[PDB]
Amino acid sequence: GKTFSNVEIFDPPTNYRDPQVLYARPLELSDGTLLGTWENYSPEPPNVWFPIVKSKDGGKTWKEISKVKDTQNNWGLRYQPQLYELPRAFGKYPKGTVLCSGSSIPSDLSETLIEVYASRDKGYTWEFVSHVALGGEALPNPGLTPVWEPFLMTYKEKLILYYSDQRDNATHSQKLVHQTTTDLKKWSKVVDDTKYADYYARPGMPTVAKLPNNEYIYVYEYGGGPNPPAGSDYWFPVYYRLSKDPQKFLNKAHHQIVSNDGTTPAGSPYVVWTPYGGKNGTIVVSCGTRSEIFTNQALGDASAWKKWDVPQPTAYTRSLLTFQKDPDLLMIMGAGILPPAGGKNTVSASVVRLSEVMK
Numbered sequence: 466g467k468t469f470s471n472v473e474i475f476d477p478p479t480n481y482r483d484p485q486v487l488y489a490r491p492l493e494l495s496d497g498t499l500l501g502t503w504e505n506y507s508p509e510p511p512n513v514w515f516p517i518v519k520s521k522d523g524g525k526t527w528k529e530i531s532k533v534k535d536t537q538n539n540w541g542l543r544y545q546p547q548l549y550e551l552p553r554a555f556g557k558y559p560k561g562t563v564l565c566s567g568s569s570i571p572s573d574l575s576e577t578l579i580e581v582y583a584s585r586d587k588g589y590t591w592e593f594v595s596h597v598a599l600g601g602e603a604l605p606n607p608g609l610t611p612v613w614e615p616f617l618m619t620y621k622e623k624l625i626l627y628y629s630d631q632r633d634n635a636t637h638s639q640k641l642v643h644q645t646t647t648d649l650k651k652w653s654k655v656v657d658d659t660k661y662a663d664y665y666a667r668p669g670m671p672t673v674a675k676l677p678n679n680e681y682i683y684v685y686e687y688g689g690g691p692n693p694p695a696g697s698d699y700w701f702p703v704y705y706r707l708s709k710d711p712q713k714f715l716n717k718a719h720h721q722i723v724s725n726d727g728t729t730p731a732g733s734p735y736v737v738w739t740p741y742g743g744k745n746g747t748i749v750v751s752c753g754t755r756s757e758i759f760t761n762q763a764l765g766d767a768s769a770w771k772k773w774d775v776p777q778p779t780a781y782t783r784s785l786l787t788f789q790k791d792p793d794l795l796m797i798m799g800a801g802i803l804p805p806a807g808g809k810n811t812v813s814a815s816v817v818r819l820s821e822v823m824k
């Protein structure tokens with residue numbers, strides 16, 4: 466069988482710091498191998514690292530094959546890891562190089578630094594590549610200037626790195642931006658992807674997927690979005706935008722995700738698209754406060770969102786991956802909840818079939 470539920474990837478030592486683990490991310494390589502990483506809250510020193518686990522049987526079993534370490538700052542690689550495989554060469558880094566981006570942060574949380582590291586041997590060894598974005602104190606409070614949450618994607622001859630940015634702290638509590646590169650060393654000026662005029666709004670957590678009508682869907686949580694539910698005065702509903710040019714979401718109309726039964730997903734979303742289910746494929750979205758997946762088989766039409774149960778539990782920024790040799794297969798991977806986590810977080814995954822789940 467290719468499907469499985471709740472297979473454990475990592476059970477953290479008892480001495481790891483709340484939340485112990487968080488922010489799981491998967492990656493499929495062109496040879497079918499899977500890589501996985503997460504925020505790894507070990508007792509320091511040594512400075513924290515991003516572990517790299519590898520599966521050769523479609524995620525049934527896993528083994529750690531390396532650690533991505535901060536070799537530049539004597540801080541550690543601490544938050545918001547993101548794995549990505551180059552689909553083409555950039556500068557001296559050929560097609561098939563594995564990138565691991567993430568934020569390097571000293572233990573005292575006084576600064577944030579989004580880095581790119583590269584592996585030329587499919588995840589066994591790593592080398593620093595470049596510093597992308599420096600920010601201030603790593604607490605999500607209005608007025609601080611941190612940067613967070615890198616997400617990578619290619620577009621033609623460019624690689625784009627999307628992230629969350631609090632540096633414009635006289636105008637936006639947080640906004641969403643990107644930089645681009647053609648060689649993985651020189652990065653463009655910051656470009657805005659999504660921002661709202663009320664200072665207290667905090668759009669965050671960008672992820673992106675390519676649709677088969679040559680548009681891209683750009684998904685994020687809209688901190689401070691309208692109509693918080695009774696008894697809340699600030700929430701993080703999931704919104705998205707559509708654009709033929711993925712450098713230009715800023716000027717595109719936004720849409721909230723709401724399923725046909727009225728469910729409003731919120732918190733730390735993650736989107737993928739898979740060439741399965743019909744001529745438009747299937748867009749799949751997870752959010753960080755519910756266990757279901759949300760699907761759209763109409764290229765992001767706002768009235769076509771569906772919702773389906775899966776056996777993988779709710780988790781912060783629960784992530785998604787679709788298998789290139791079988792688009793019907795969906796991996797859902799998580800590393801538990803935001804602290805306080807009560808010592809309960811583990812890193813785990815399920816593989817489901819959209820054909821079975823979508824009934």
Ligand SMILES: OC[C@@H]1O[C@@H](OC[C@@H]2O[C@@H](O)[C@H](O)[C@H]2O)[C@H](O)[C@H]1O
Pocket residue numbers: 487488504544545603604605613614629639668669670733803804
């Ligand atoms: O990833 C660990 C997590 O990051 C910090 O918050 C960042 C905050 O999270 C999103 O919801 C927003 O885009 C961003 O400002 C937390 O302090 C830490 O637990």
